[PDB]
């Protein structure tokens, strides 16, 4: 349950996962490494391919978060939520960026592996 | 809603829902006369997309400008030159 | 304290809605309608609103000491096919009297017959405007 208000949580999805063009072979047992990275894929469906228009849209939206202004927004959000009294929010000095060069390189390697 | 081109005055109609309330004032739409992207301004008001609760589909309805704009481009004196080629009611 | 408003007895709490497939309710309704048809209290009808509303209706109501004979256009219908809950809305205007009748189907004393065989939507609109003007006028001022 959601800890804040103890509300019951529900996972809602579509049924025919395999008959779909997108989301063919996607694994939702655990989320991706980042929210802008492509979702997990089972080992059996590693060679799957996605529609090119949706792929380009996702690539644009993900490259949106690869800039330094996003890192500044991230640290500023840390500062805002720390000033607003929210606990378990580290100091913007202790925070670290979600997207770095080596991490992006290995994620690109994994994306080319998943083709 | 009814919008006009800022450059040439070309007018087209399209209802605005609750998901496009931010684009009711100014629309960046492709103009067929200017053959490029032009800014469109709000000219007249249509009824709505959905339905007012316990009110018919006519409520509220478009303004007198929208009703006049339609009647000049499609009506008795407007479709008469076009009723001789196809008579749109038929194919 | 001294009374109780609710009952938790099994007989009353239990419902039988799950077992309604063993009962053909719609078939029983159609059987009642067909019984009325064969007895002559109503005649079978099938139409849509766009083709029923606006048709003149001749209604003879058996009342003492003399039946009342009216002619009034259809303003609305409540059921497309024939049914025990068919319903019919009729606006009848006499020499100085304007009335809005809702005649139910299957009454042996209220014999109403549709005669136009057609819709006449423009006549419906005219009668609607007439009734609206008369209704707004009739209020005392």
């Amino acid at each position: 349950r959601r800890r804040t208000d103890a509300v019951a949580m529900y996972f809602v999805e579509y049924k025919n996962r395999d008959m779909s063009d997108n989301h063919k072979g996607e694994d939702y047992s655990a989320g991706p490494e980042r929210f802008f990275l492509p979702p997990r894929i089972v080992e059996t469906e590693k060679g799957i391919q996605r529609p090119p228009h949706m792929q380009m849209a996702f690539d644009r939206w993900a490259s949106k978060f690869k800039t330094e202004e996003f890192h500044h927004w991230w640290r500023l959000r840390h500062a805002k939520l720390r000033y607003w009294g929210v606990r378990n929010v580290p100091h913007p000095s202790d925070v670290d960026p979600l997207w770095t060069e080596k991490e992006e390189e290995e994620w690109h390697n994994e994306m080319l592996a998943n083709t | 809603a009814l919008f006009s081109c800022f450059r040439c005055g070309y007018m087209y109609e399209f209802a605005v829902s609750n998901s496009y309330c931010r684009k009711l004032t100014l629309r960046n739409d492709h103009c067929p006369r200017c053959d490029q992207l032009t800014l469109f301004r709000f000219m007249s008001v249509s009824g709505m997309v959905g339905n007012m609760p316990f009110k018919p589909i006519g409520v509220p309805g478009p303004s007198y400008a929208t009703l006049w704009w339609r009647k000049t481009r499609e009506g008795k004196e407007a479709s008469a030159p076009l009723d001789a080629v196809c008579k749109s009611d038929r194919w | 304290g001294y009374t109780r408003e609710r009952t938790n007895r099994h007989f009353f709490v239990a419902r039988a809605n799950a077992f309604f497939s063993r009962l053909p309710i719609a078939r029983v309704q159609r059987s009642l309608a067909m019984e009325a048809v064969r007895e002559g209290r109503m005649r079978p009808w099938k139409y849509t609103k766009e083709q029923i509303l606006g048709a003149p209706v001749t209604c003879n109501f058996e009342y003492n000491p003399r039946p009342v004979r009216l002619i009034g256009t259809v303003m609305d219908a409540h059921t497309e096919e024939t049914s025990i809950k068919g319903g019919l809305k009729v606006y009848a205007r006499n020499e100085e009297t304007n009335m809005m009748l809702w005649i139910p189907p299957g009454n042996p004393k209220l014999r109403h017959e549709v005669t136009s065989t057609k819709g006449s939507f423009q006549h419906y609109l005219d009668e609607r405007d007439k009734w609206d003007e008369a209704w707004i006028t009739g209020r005392a001022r």
Binding site: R3, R82, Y83, G85, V86, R87, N88, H91 | - | -
Partner: protein, 162 residues
């Protein structure tokens, strides 16, 4: 089905302990000296104090996300006005640093490294030794093979704890 719960009277009425007059417990010289809680029955194999520095993440996890705490990076009152400590903290300072008092050093100084001296009171009484070092400002002597205690040296990166 239902667990047995009972309201405790200590949560309804628990006053403070009787304080000590002149800081004197009237039975110090009468009762034996045993560690606190042993004879009463209070015992514990492990004590986890959630106020330590290493338990901060556990405390903040056990706390709820709804309850917020403000002034996390700043403070309403200016923290650069000099002001005195608490009474117990000033007493700790006075009890620890006693050589800060004026004219604390003994005069004349007679104890120099190389003198043979006997311990006349305290632990190791009647034992002889040679003065090794002299901490003159603290009025302290380091005698040879007298009051030998283990000096714990913490473990560094490349050196273990000795």
């Amino acid at each position: 089905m239902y667990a047995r719960f009972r309201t405790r009277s200590k949560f309804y009425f628990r006053p403070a302990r009787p304080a000590l007059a002149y800081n004197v417990d009237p039975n110090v010289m009468r009762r034996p000296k045993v560690k606190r809680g042993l004879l009463k029955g209070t015992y514990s194999d492990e004590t986890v104090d959630l106020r330590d520095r290493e338990r901060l993440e556990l405390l903040e996890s056990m706390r709820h996300p709804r309850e917020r705490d403000f002034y996390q990076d700043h403070t309403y009152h200016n923290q650069w006005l000099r002001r005195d400590l608490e009474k117990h903290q000033k007493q700790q300072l006075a009890a620890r640093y006693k050589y800060f008092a004026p004219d604390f050093e003994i005069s004349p100084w007679i104890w120099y490294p190389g003198d043979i001296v006997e311990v006349v009171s305290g632990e190791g009484i009647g034992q002889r030794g040679t003065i090794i070092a002299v901490i003159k400002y603290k009025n302290e002597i380091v005698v040879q093979n007298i009051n030998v205690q283990d000096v714990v040296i913490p473990a560094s990166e490349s050196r273990p704890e000795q």
